[PDB]
Amino acid sequence: LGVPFFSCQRGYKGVWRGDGIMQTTCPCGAQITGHVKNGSMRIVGPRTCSNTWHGTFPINAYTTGPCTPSPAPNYSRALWRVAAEEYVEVTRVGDFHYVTGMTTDNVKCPCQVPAPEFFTEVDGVRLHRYAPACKPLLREEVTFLVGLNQYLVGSQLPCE
Amino acid sequence: GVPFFSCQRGYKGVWRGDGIMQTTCPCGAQITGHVKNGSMRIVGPRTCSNTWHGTFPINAYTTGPCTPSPAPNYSRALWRVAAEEYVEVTRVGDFHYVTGMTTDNVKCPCQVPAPEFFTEVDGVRLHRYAPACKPLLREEVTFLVGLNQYLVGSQLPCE
Ligand SMILES: [Zn+2]
Numbered sequence: 605l606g607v608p609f610f611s612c613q614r615g616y617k618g619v620w621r622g623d624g625i626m627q628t629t630c631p632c633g634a635q636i637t638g639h640v641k642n643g644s645m646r647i648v649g650p651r652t653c654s655n656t657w658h659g660t661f662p663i664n665a666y667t668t669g670p671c672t673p674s675p676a677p678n679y680s681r682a683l684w685r686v687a688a689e690e691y692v693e694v695t696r697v698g699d700f701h702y703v704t705g706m707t708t709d710n711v712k713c714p715c716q717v718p719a720p721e722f723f724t725e726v727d728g729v730r731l732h733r734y735a736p737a738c739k740p741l742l743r744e745e746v747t748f749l750v751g752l753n754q755y756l757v758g759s760q761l762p763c764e
Numbered sequence: 765g766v767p768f769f770s771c772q773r774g775y776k777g778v779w780r781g782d783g784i785m786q787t788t789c790p791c792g793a794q795i796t797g798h799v800k801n802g803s804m805r806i807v808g809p810r811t812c813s814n815t816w817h818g819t820f821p822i823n824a825y826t827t828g829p830c831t832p833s834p835a836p837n838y839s840r841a842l843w844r845v846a847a848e849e850y851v852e853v854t855r856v857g858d859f860h861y862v863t864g865m866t867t868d869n870v871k872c873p874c875q876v877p878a879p880e881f882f883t884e885v886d887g888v889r890l891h892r893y894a895p896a897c898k899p900l901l902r903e904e905v906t907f908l909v910g911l912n913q914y915l916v917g918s919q920l921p922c923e
């Protein structure tokens with residue numbers, strides 16, 4: 605049962621790539637419409653959805669339309685999907701990035717981070733339509749694989 | 765919006781996640797997929813090739829909690845390696861080769877991902893959002909893996 609405000613997903617507010625009409629459903633039940641033109645989204649929604657009031661658009665498995673978010677480069681943390689059902693948590697310090705969490709020990713991730721629009725989530729905001737459930741993040745005494753080498757959790761990504 | 769001929773080529777195979785998928789084919793048809801045990805039951809009008817072929821066209825109008833889990837035994841795939849750039853990968857046995865790219869000097873990861881990370885596999889789109897694919901350049905262009913450069917047609921180095 606969707607409930608106003610308490611059920612609401614934290615939506616995206618920012619630059620969009622592509623123009624047209626976006627459509628989504630907030631977990632509260634609200635249908636949110638985004639009118640996108642020149643990188644900017646105008647939000648239409650009901651009074652009962654936190655997204656309507658914040659001017660945000662909750663991206664999820666029920667999002668449709670031609671546009672995609674282009675997230676701001678000043679993010680702190682991101683969820684990066686590195687295998688079919690596995691995630692690494694990326695922490696951005698300056699221009700450097702660190703794997704600070706993972707869903708399973710010895711998860712293999714690419715040696716460099718992609719552009720932020722390839723992240724599943726940035727600072728708690730979902731960016732992708734399909735995304736597997738994130739398992740609880742392991743942040744202690746775990747390692748990740750890059751090729752043949754093992755790196756300790758908190759390590760910088762090999763290529764930087 | 766012409767029946768059969770406007771139609772997008774759709775996916776048929778294993779899905780992960782069970783539940784109800786919905787999409788709109790470019791012909792205008794609404795197609796529903798009921799996913800149970802990784803298998804999809806199609807419901808659609810007889811005016812769409814996807815109904816007639818048992819397939820499900822994944823695009824910007826797809827909704828539902830499931831995703832394709834394609835067999836690792838494709839021949840060619842489209843791989844989105846930058847915001848608006850793609851590489852074409854050709855598989856031969858356990859080896860992969862970059863056989864096309866949308867711009868010269870594209871950088872790509874050294875390893876191909878699992879197939880569900882491809883935007884297209886053998887002409888079947890797998891991803892909901894996907895930027896338009898510019899013409900694929902298949903000759904006299906280079907791709908980069910880290911600091912190393914390779915001519916089109918070359919194997920990906922982490923193999
Ligand atoms: Zn809501």
Ligand SMILES: [Zn+2]
Pocket residue numbers: 767768770771772789790791792793811812813814
């Ligand atoms: Zn059709």
